[PDB]
Amino acid sequence: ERPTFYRQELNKTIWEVPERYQNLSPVGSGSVCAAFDTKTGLRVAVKKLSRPFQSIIHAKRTYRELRLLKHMKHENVIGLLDVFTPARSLEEFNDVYLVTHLMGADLNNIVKSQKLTDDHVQFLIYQILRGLKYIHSADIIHRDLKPSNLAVNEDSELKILDFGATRWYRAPEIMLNWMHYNQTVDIWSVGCIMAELLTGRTLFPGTDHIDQLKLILRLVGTPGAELLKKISSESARNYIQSLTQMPKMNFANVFIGANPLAVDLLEKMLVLDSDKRITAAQALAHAYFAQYHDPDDEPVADPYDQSLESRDLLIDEWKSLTYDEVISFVPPPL
Ligand SMILES: Cc1ccc(-n2nc(C(C)(C)C)cc2NC(=O)Nc2nc(CCOCc3ccncc3)cs2)cc1
Ligand SMILES: CCCCCCCCO[C@@H]1O[C@H](CO)[C@@H](O)[C@H](O)[C@H]1O
């Protein structure tokens, strides 16, 4: 019942993998190998976790990443094809390998800093939003959505993932270290991605943190009264009160020649006040996605318990809990 493993040697480490996985070729530092899975006939990424139980911190991340990927089962969210260890018992458990689909590209490798047709933009943003609907219904905020976190195959089929400038896609409240993120920080990132796919150009290419916030304010305006009332920081309150009011720009004069439904969607994504931004569920119902939208095929997740990973446990306890997740893993049907 236990598969037969082979001990090869890549990127200065003894990988030990099941025989089904062949032609292991390294692709970037855990360290990840590309492989061919003879059991399914798929090209796969095998990730050897790095020093998973070296420290409490490593042990927690290992367990958090494994737990969450096991939970994630949606076409537009990365998921697990397999999880394995060479260990036969908990007492020798020291390495964790994760296996997923090999996509071949991220969104930059697809975009090449070029304009996409309006139709292609629809299909790509629809899939991001559909994947965010699922994630957000699990009560998870991504927080670092950007093109390098989006895997795309040749047919432009898209998966959201998290590899663990980047700041270009970050919501203003995150740049400013507010400590109460709503899920629409991810919608902010979607809006920045969409703009750039439509225009060929980064929407906010800040040279640095302050510049990034100057660029944002230029597009969306300085905070109104309703937003200013929501600021608890006195020093933040004061500084904003001291700014020269700037009007919000008219997006049609920024996205010249785009579909006006794309323009209208961008106006609903890139609202300074995060409470006033469109949600993922809402955005999928927007007429921009009329050709792709299907209310009966836009699934939600069972809610996910994040308190399990926020515990303060001993190394051996995280390890024994990670071991259990390895053992209970059930692959998907193919
Ligand atoms: C500590 C922690 C916990 C959770 C997460 N999250 N949260 C998320 C979502 C569920 C999106 C919120 C996803 C992840 N994690 C995640 O994506 N991990 C990855 N594993 C690989 C292995 C294969 O790489 C190459 C490859 C992949 C695909 N196509 C070609 C090449 C890639 S990305 C991150 C860190
Ligand atoms: C440069 C100053 C303007 C930036 C204002 C950020 C607007 C985000 O808006 C704010 O999102 C916060 C979540 O962190 C919530 O606490 C607030 O309810 C919401 O209004």
Side-chain angles (χ1 to χ4, degrees), residues 2-10 13-334:
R2 182 200 179 263
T4 297
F5 282 68
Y6 69 96
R7 289 181 77 109
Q8 212 193 300
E9 130 89 37
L10 316 91
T13 149
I14 282 194
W15 291 53
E16 198 164 341
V17 310
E19 290 191 294
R20 74 196 270 186
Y21 302 115
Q22 297 286 328
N23 307 324
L24 260 43
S25 171
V27 286
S29 283
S31 34
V32 168
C33 278
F36 179 73
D37 183 9
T38 70
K39 178 175 206 93
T40 51
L42 304 169
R43 335 218 323 248
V44 294
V46 183
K47 186 201 195 179
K48 183 187 207 185
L49 263 13
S50 259
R51 320 181 171 278
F53 311 111
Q54 154 157 323
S55 59
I56 274 150
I57 265 302
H58 273 215
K60 259 167 82 96
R61 287 180 191 161
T62 302
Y63 168 86
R64 160 171 144 76
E65 188 171 32
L66 178 55
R67 230 193 145 244
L68 188 45
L69 291 180
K70 287 181 65 188
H71 198 80
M72 291 295 97
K73 296 176 153 80
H74 187 280
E75 297 140 62
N76 309 127
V77 179
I78 205 246
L80 285 185
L81 294 191
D82 196 22
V83 55
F84 67 83
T85 181
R88 323 217 170 98
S89 65
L90 170 62
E91 307 84 55
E92 35 155 32
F93 184 45
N94 263 123
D95 292 301
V96 173
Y97 296 73
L98 310 176
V99 182
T100 62
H101 280 292
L102 194 68
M103 232 73 196
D106 71 14
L107 231 212
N108 305 120
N109 314 330
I110 281 276
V111 67
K112 291 104 110 66
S113 319
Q114 280 286 160
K115 283 182 173 201
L116 298 189
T117 49
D118 190 49
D119 284 319
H120 198 187
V121 179
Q122 289 173 203
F123 177 54
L124 289 182
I125 304 304
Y126 176 75
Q127 300 180 85
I128 302 169
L129 285 165
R130 178 171 180 267
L132 279 178
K133 179 188 178 190
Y134 180 81
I135 288 169
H136 286 179
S137 66
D139 212 63
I140 295 159
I141 316 180
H142 192 289
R143 262 159 214 111
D144 203 19
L145 242 223
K146 63 201 169 163
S148 69
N149 271 159
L150 300 163
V152 195
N153 71 17
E154 257 178 296
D155 297 86
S156 289
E157 297 171 331
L158 178 147
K159 290 180 186 282
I160 295 164
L161 50 70
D162 190 345
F163 286 130
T166 295
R167 82 186 102 72
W168 290 347
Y169 307 91
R170 259 176 200 154
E173 59 271 23
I174 298 184
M175 302 295 293
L176 288 167
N177 205 66
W178 273 197
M179 268 321 240
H180 304 280
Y181 305 120
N182 113 280
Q183 289 173 158
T184 60
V185 302
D186 290 330
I187 295 299
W188 180 269
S189 311
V190 169
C192 300
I193 289 158
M194 181 163 156
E196 154 172 0
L197 290 179
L198 279 168
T199 66
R201 303 155 84 267
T202 309
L203 177 67
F204 306 114
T207 56
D208 68 22
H209 271 250
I210 288 305
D211 199 43
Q212 184 81 45
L213 297 157
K214 284 177 176 165
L215 293 179
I216 291 151
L217 293 180
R218 279 226 220 162
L219 187 66
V220 304
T222 51
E226 181 184 42
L227 184 51
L228 228 319
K229 272 132 162 172
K230 290 165 168 190
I231 313 305
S232 70
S233 189
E234 250 214 283
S235 85
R237 180 179 207 72
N238 303 338
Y239 178 85
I240 292 156
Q241 272 179 323
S242 302
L243 274 171
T244 293
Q245 287 317 290
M246 216 167 173
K248 145 140 140 41
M249 289 191 305
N250 183 244
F251 282 32
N253 294 339
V254 178
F255 309 99
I256 293 136
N259 191 339
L261 295 173
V263 181
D264 176 73
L265 217 225
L266 282 166
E267 295 268 31
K268 303 187 217 304
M269 287 173 163
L270 296 164
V271 178
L272 200 60
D273 184 348
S274 72
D275 295 316
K276 297 256 175 273
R277 296 176 200 153
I278 196 160
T279 72
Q282 292 166 344
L284 294 166
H286 187 281
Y288 187 64
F289 301 113
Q291 71 185 137
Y292 296 111
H293 169 61
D294 177 1
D296 310 310
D297 191 30
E298 283 166 355
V300 298
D302 313 316
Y304 173 81
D305 183 3
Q306 287 132 76
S307 75
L308 284 174
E309 68 213 17
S310 302
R311 284 182 289 174
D312 292 312
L313 303 180
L314 297 165
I315 285 185
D316 280 359
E317 285 172 314
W318 284 122
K319 171 156 137 181
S320 179
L321 285 169
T322 301
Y323 192 72
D324 299 345
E325 299 287 345
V326 175
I327 285 313
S328 61
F329 175 80
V330 169
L334 281 105

